[PDB]
Design a protein around this ligand. Structure first.
Ligand SMILES: C[S@](=O)c1ccc(-c2nc(-c3ccc(F)cc3)c(-c3ccncc3)[nH]2)cc1
Ligand SMILES: [Mg+2]
Ligand SMILES: [Mg+2]
Length: 334
């Protein structure tokens, strides 16, 4: 009922994993934690093992750890990371310190993409399609990514694309500053900046700070109009913006010159300052740009997700217990 674990130290980090996972090779590390490629002897496929960094060092971390485990256990969709296994070496809650997450190995991300490129750039269509397909699903459970960027989006040798861990270059201007009650469509903005970057090769808005970032966004999409200024509840921001010289909305065809005109039409519908006017994932899939891949019979919505815990205010030992309960109750895919 409990497997056999084995110790291992990979550049100054303790890896204690069940013996079914072999040939652990580091692929990267950061704030999220440490990830290793590995061979799963049970299923026989290549997996990625993530060890959470300092999972219970504060109420923020402990709650963040619980959040990630709850989200990842909920996601059943081809364009979103699924959990194959979650485990801890600890035999009880008393000594429960570390958490490991297991998903199928993804060779690269949207920064890399050399396995998918062709001269026509018909790869872009398939890559953005998969993002929107996974966003529709995520957004259907009232989940918003917020920090969507090319390193968040994994890709295989087959150019299958998946989202994971839910600069400021791709951040929707409404959440850089906070004018209105920011909705799902913050992510559609990030897809805009990503798509554009895949079509030109250059970062669309490579701003050096929150000042420079809003300067570069307004250069392209023009300063807020009469009807958008109205809906900004923050005086700081309404002062910030009205104090700046009026910029006109540029012609997208002239900016994105030599790119599929169907792509330009989609960009124009993604990069609007007004979140209420901006295209949804569900709508964007139906855009003619994706006519090849689109199918409303195989673009599914997620089951309802219980986000009631986000409001709740508990101690680290309480989150840890709630986290521990989610590891024990885990069941893999059939
Ligand atoms: C800091 S940057 O945004 C960033 C954050 C997380 C990850 C990142 N997190 C994972 C990862 C691994 C296992 C899990 F169970 C969950 C997530 C992977 C992963 C998954 C499969 N094959 C290769 C790598 N990459 C990569 C980059
Ligand atoms: Mg990685
Ligand atoms: Mg999934």
């Amino acid at each position: 009922e409990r497997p056999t674990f084995y110790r291992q130290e990979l550049n100054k980090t303790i890896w204690e994993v069940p013996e079914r996972y072999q040939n652990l090779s580091p692929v990267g590390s950061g704030a999220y934690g440490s990830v290793c490629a590995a061979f799963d002897t049970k299923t026989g496929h290549r997996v990625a093992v993530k060890k959470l960094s300092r999972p219970f060092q504060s109420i923020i971390h402990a709650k963040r750890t619980y959040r990630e485990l709850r989200l990842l256990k909920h996601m059943k969709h081809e364009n979103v990371i699924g959990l194959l296994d979650v485990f801890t070496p600890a035999r009880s809650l008393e000594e429960f310190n570390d958490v490991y997450l297991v998903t199928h190995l993804m060779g690269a991300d949207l920064n890399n993409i050399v396995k998918c490129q062709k001269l026509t750039d018909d790869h872009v269509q398939f890559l953005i399609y998969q993002i929107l397909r996974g966003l529709k699903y995520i957004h259907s459970a009232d989940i918003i990514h917020r920090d969507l960027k090319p390193s968040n989006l994994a890709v295989n040798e087959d150019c299958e694309l998946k989202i994971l861990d839910f600069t400021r270059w791709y951040r929707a201007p409404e959440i850089m500053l906070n004018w209105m009650h920011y909705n799902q469509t913050v992510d559609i903005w990030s897809v805009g900046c990503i798509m554009a970057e895949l079509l030109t090769g250059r970062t669309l808005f490579p701003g050096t700070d929150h000042i420079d970032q809003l300067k570069l966004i307004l250069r392209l999409v023009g300063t807020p109009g009469a009807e958008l200024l109205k809906k900004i509840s923050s005086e700081s921001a309404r002062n910030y913006i009205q104090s700046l010289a009026q910029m006109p909305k540029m012609n997208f065809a002239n900016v994105f010159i030599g790119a599929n005109p169907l792509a330009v039409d989609l960009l124009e519908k993604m990069l609007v300052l007004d979140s209420d006017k901006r295209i949804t994932a569900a709508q964007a899939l139906a855009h003619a740009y994706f006519a090849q891949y689109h199918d409303p019979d195989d673009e599914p919505v997620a089951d309802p997700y219980d986000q009631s815990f986000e409001s709740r205010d508990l101690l680290i030992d309480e989150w840890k217990s709630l986290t521990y309960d989610e590891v024990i109750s885990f069941v893999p895919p059939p």
